[PDB]
Amino acid sequence: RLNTLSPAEGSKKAGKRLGRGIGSGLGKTGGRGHKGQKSRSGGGVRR
Amino acid sequence: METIAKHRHARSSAQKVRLVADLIRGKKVSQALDILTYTNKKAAVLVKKVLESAIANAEHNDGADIDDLKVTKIFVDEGPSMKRIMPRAKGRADRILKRTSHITVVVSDR
Amino acid sequence: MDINWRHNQSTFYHFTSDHRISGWKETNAMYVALNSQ
Amino acid sequence: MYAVFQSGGKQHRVSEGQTVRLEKLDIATGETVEFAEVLMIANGEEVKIGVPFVDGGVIKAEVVAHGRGEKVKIVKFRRRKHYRKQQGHRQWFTDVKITGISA
Amino acid sequence: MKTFTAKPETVKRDWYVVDATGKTLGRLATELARRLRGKHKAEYTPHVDTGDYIIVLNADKVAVTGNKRTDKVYYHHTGHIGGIKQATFEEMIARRPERVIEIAVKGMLPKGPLGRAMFRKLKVYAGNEHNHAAQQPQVLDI
Amino acid sequence: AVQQNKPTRSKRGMRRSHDALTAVTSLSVDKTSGEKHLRHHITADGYYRGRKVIAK
Amino acid sequence: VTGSGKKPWRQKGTGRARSGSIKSPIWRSGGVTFAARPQDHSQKVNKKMYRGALKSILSELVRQDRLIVVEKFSVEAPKTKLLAQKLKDMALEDVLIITGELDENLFLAARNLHKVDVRDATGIDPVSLIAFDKVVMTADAVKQVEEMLA
Amino acid sequence: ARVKRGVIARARHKKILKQAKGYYGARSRVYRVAFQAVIKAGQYAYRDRRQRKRQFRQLWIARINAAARQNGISYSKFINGLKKASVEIDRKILADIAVFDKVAFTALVEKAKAALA
RNA sequence: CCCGGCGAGGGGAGUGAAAAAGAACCUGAAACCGUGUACGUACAAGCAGUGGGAGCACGCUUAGGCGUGUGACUGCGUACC
RNA sequence: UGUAACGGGGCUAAACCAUGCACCGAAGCUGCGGCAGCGACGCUUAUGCGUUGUUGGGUAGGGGAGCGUUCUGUAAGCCUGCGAAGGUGUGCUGUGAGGCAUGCUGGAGGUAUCAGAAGUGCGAAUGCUGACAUAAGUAACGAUAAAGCGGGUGAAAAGCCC
């Protein structure tokens, strides 16, 4: 029965994949808005 | 009975050959040879050799009787280009596409 | 031919000449810029 | 002799023995329905409605085929704003056949 | 079922003769445009020429109100540059009055291939007689 | 000096509508030799208007 | 990627797009963007979750009649023929034999049989109790299992 | 686990290009233009599932207006008449009777003039 | 064996299960280029579609008046990022 | 630049003012059919319905739910030379990403279900690589020292040899 075991309900959440398409919700800008220092790779200010 | 001859890899671009092929398409064969004898193109020499080869394949490999044959199909496909280099001014080069073609003459009596 | 074509596309990649566009193309861009000032 | 009757949402002008494609009725496949709300009967003498639906008229129609119509694509693209949404739709229908028209 | 569409092979269309003496230009023109579309027929179909052939006659005797006899100006440009060429209403009635009724009706008809085909059915004459006795045009009193 | 939209293959064939070669249109038959030749030209055997010329 | 850090063309004036390295990940022959490294895929399983899981699977092997308890299970000589005949007599093809004292002859007799696996009671894993159709425990192995799983 | 993406990309492109048969030139050959053509056809198709209801209604009104003026009353007065005569025939059917059955349409005009007076 | 310049290329023959497996050789996509057939197109203006839609050509079909291709004419309609 | 300050024709009312009754008019509201979210509510209790109310334009962005790809386990199982993957058509199907069946090509592999991991989905980056178009059978064929004829060889001679 190793093909009948199954995880709990709610334990494995999907994982945001950014940059794929328009339907996914997080495409083009991946959830990081328009230009600026925060929309840049490595970008962000210090603590 | 349809009888084919082809010249694959003919050094002449397919445009230049298609002018001549468009001349003899549909004609009876002796009339087509009389057209290609008096057409002053390089392509008419090539097309004439393919047509003469198709009459010979018809009369030898198939049933005879040249006088009933007609050029039913003729078409010129494009072959592979030979990519060469023309030296232009100021140090720049071009690719010359030395173009080939594939002449097909399907001759038939019906 | 392919080797000569890759190198002879690689001819004006590290150029300097400023009156010639892209190293080689002649123009009037000196007078255009100079007249814009 | 034709007859106009009201049906699901809309109206139909129908002779006898003619197959009509209506909206989805909640009827079994071989079962017979009656439309008691006929608006016109014309044979060579017209009969229509001062007050609506004709007093003595009814259309007996046998249901032929429930079904689901041609797919249509619904496309919602907002140019230049990063929004598109496609969707599809097959409308349920009911083919009936007019058994008879009683004036 | 589907809404009926007139079929241009099977459209029957009649011939009408209209006397344009003392009619107002726009009001006649609008009635002719209605009859040439085929808007007066129950088999009207917007992509089919269903209208009738109208023979307008006495086109030089058409009337306009106010000072439009002298102030209404017909401009056209010739394509060459300073080619703006005007002609008042009475100059047009003198030169070619057919152009008066035909300009009016043409501007009332839908622009496009169909409305050109609709204008080919209008036949205007400046006189009282027409060549079209073979087609038997019945007198459309409008 | 250079195009601004790539022309179609439609417009390309339309331009080549006139590039067609005309046939010969009929070539004439010699009087004596009975063989075929362009008109007003000599034959392959070297006759013209039924008399022998060149003869190479 | 085995290349050079020479910039392939000048920054401005060629009409080419700007490029800086021939080892860019956008370039053919260029170097994976987020290239992988050798990594460890081990998960921590808490000890009480491992033992809990074994208790659940043993309870379901008992409940689904996939658990056979024999008193003794040993083969005469180290021959796969003898173990094949022995498992044939007991109506078992796919089987996990588990014995509290690992016999040498049994181990050599099951080494060629594909479906059959002999374990000591110490080294059982979840994936084999679930994998094999029947589990055949020696009684000594049952006692050792209860000592392991408390 | 490297995933090559040839086969599924080919399937998407092909899906779009099958939805663009019959378009002129690149619109039916090149993916990058057939994608835009297919979408713009989608937007038009939506928009025109609404306009066909508007266009058919204006066609029917023009036919009832023609046939009713043939029977000596305008469209406006005819619809007012039939609403006051409490006739609920919609105008698809009035257009269709007005083409196919001239006598029934004449009788409808008589109900309209009868109630309208 | 035949055409061909004791060519190139081809057509047969033969091997092969298969030579549109022939060395330019497994599969053989797309762009791009052709040949053939059906329809449209030489008085008509524009993101080239879409809604309507006649006619024609092929298949049906117990004529059931459908399907496929084309698409005159007509409403609306200024690509994507 | 051309009427060119009603959209146009054209209008002496088809203008303006006052009153009134019609009709047209949107993706508004209603009718009919369908789907989905959030409440409430009697059961069904691990949820579906006789219900029932109401909501469903959407950028940045947040939340939820899925499809496909490659790889691992299930799988020494199950499909497969009576023909796999792939390629190319057709038909059916789901709200969608998609799925399923099958003709032809192909000629040897594919993989359910339920889990697991990702080099997991491209139309754009003057993106990288290959192929192929376009202008186009167009400019050009590289000193304006210059060729003409006879003969030979050859399948063919302006260019080779004499």
D60 close to D100: Cβ distance less than 8 angstroms: yes
Where are the alpha helices (H) located in H71-101, listed in sequence order?
Answer: 75-84, 91-100
- Alpha-carbon span H11 to H37, nearest angstrom: 18
> Residue H87 CA to J21 C1' — how many Å?
20
Query: Which residues of chain D have a CB within 8 Å of the CB of H87?
Result: 39, 48-50, 52
Give the separation between CA D2 and CA B61, rounded to whole angstroms: 73
Structurally, how many domains does chain F consist of?
A: 1
Dihedral of CA G72/G75/G80/G86: which sign? Answer: negative
Region label for D52, one of left (φ > 0), alpha (ψ between -120 and 50) or beta (otherwise): beta
Q: How far is the CA of A1 from the C1' of J114 (A)?
A: 9
Q: How far apart are CA B45 and CA B103, in angstroms?
A: 12
* Identity of residue E38: G
Task: List the domain range (segments joined by +) for residue H19.
Answer: 1-117
User: Count of CB contacts below 8 A, B vs C?
Assistant: 23
B83 touches chain C (CB under 8 A): yes
Nearest to D82 by CA among H100, H56, A24: A24
Q: Provide the H-helix boundaries in chain F.
A: 9-15
Of F8, D76, D70, the closest CA to residue H28 belongs to: F8
All structural domains of chain B with their residue ranges? 1-110
Residue H75's CB is within 10 A of a number of other CB atoms, namely 18
Give the angle subtended at the CA of G43 by the CAs of G40 and G48, to the nearest 5°.
155
Q: Strand J: which bases are under 7 Å from protein Cβ? A: 1-4, 8-14, 22-27, 31-34, 58-66, 68-71, 73-76, 86-90, 93-99, 112-123, 125-137, 142, 151
- In degrees and rounded to multiples of 5, residue A29 shows phi and psi of 100, -5
Task: To the nearest 10°, report the CA torsion of H100, H101, H106, H107.
Answer: -140
CA–C1' gap, F54 and J151, in angstroms: 16
Is CATH 2.60.40.10 the classification given to domain B1-110?
A: no
Contact criterion met (CB < 8 Å) for A5 and G130:
yes
User: What is the spatial distance between Cα H27 and Cα H37, in angstroms, rounded to a whole number?
Assistant: 6
CA–CA min distance H7, chain E (Å)? 44
Pairing of strands E53-57, E15-19: parallel
The letter for the amino acid at D3 is A
- Neighboring chain B residues of C4 at a CB cutoff of 8 Å: 85, 93
- Contact assessment for residue H42 and residue D72, using Cβ atoms and an 8 Å cutoff: no
**Structural domain for F45, as ranges:** 1-55
What's the burial of H31, exposed, middle or buried (CB within 10 Å: 0-12/13-18/19+)?
middle
Q: Is D80 helix (H, G, I), strand (E, B) or coil?
A: coil
Name the fold adopted by G1-149: Ribosomal Protein L4; Chain: A; (3.40.1370)
Q: In whole angstroms, give the CA distance from residue G133 to residue G121.
A: 18
d(C-alpha H116, C-alpha F53), whole Å: 107
Tally DSSP H helices, then E strands, for chain E: 5, 6
Residues in C closer than 8 angstroms to G10, CB to CB, are: 13-15
* CA separation for the pair F42, F52 (Å, rounded): 10
**Buried/exposed G39-65: b ≥16 CB within 10 Å, e otherwise:** eeeeeeeeeeeeeeebeebbeebeeee
DSSP letter (8 states) at residue F56: -
* Beta carbon pairs, A and D, within 8 Å: 7
**Which single residue has its CA nearest the C1' atom of nucleotide I80?**
H36
Distant-in-sequence, close-in-space partners of G29: CB < 8 Å, separation ≥ 6: G1, G22
Determine which helix (DSSP H) or strand (DSSP E) holds E138, and give its type and residue range.
Answer: strand E138-139
Q: Is the Cβ pair A1, G130 closer than 8 Å? A: yes
Distance, CA of B63 to CA of B109 (rounded, Å): 9
**Which residues touch H16 (CB under 8 Å, ≥6 apart)?**
H31, H34, H35, H38
| Residue F51: strand pairing partners | F48
Q: Looking at the DSSP assignment, which residues form a beta bridge with residue D86?
A: D75
Q: Are B5 and B48 in contact (CB under 8 A)?
A: no
Of B108, B84, B99, B107, the C-alpha closest to B10 is: B99
Number of H-type helices and E-type strands within chain G: 5, 4
Amino acid at G96: L
Structure tokens at H2: 């490297």
Contact between residue H64 and residue H78 where contact means Cβ atoms under 8 Å apart? yes
CB of C15 less than 8 A from some CB of G = yes
Angle at CA of residue G30, ends G25 and G36, nearest 5°: 70
Q: What is the DSSP letter of H27?
A: G
Q: Which tokens belong to H17?
A: 């290009």
By three-state DSSP, how is residue H30 classified?
coil
How many angstroms separate the CA atoms of G4 and G1, rounded?
A: 9
CA dist., res. B43 & res. F47, Å (int)? 28
Q: How distant is the alpha carbon of residue C35 from its chain centre?
A: 21
CB E17 within 8 A of CB H113: no
G10: contact with C, CB 8 A cutoff: yes
Report how far residue E2's alpha carbon sits from residue D25's, in angstroms, rounded to the nearest whole number. Answer: 21
Determination technique for this entry: cryo-EM
- Residue E118 tokens, joined: 């609709």
| Binary contact (B85, C4; C-beta < 8 A) | yes
Which residues sit opposite H56 in a β-bridge? Answer: none
CA atoms of D19 and D12, how far apart (whole Å): 11
Cross-chain residue pair C22–G10, CB shorter than 8 Å: no
Question: Total structural domains in chain D?
Answer: 1
User: Chains C vs E: touching, with 3+ CB pairs under 8 Å?
Assistant: no
Task: Give the type of residue at F20.
Answer: A
Q: What separation in angstroms does the CA of G11 have from each of B82, C7, D70?
A: 34, 19, 57
Q: CA B24 to CA B74: how far, in whole Å? A: 8
DSSP-derived 3-state class of residue B39: coil
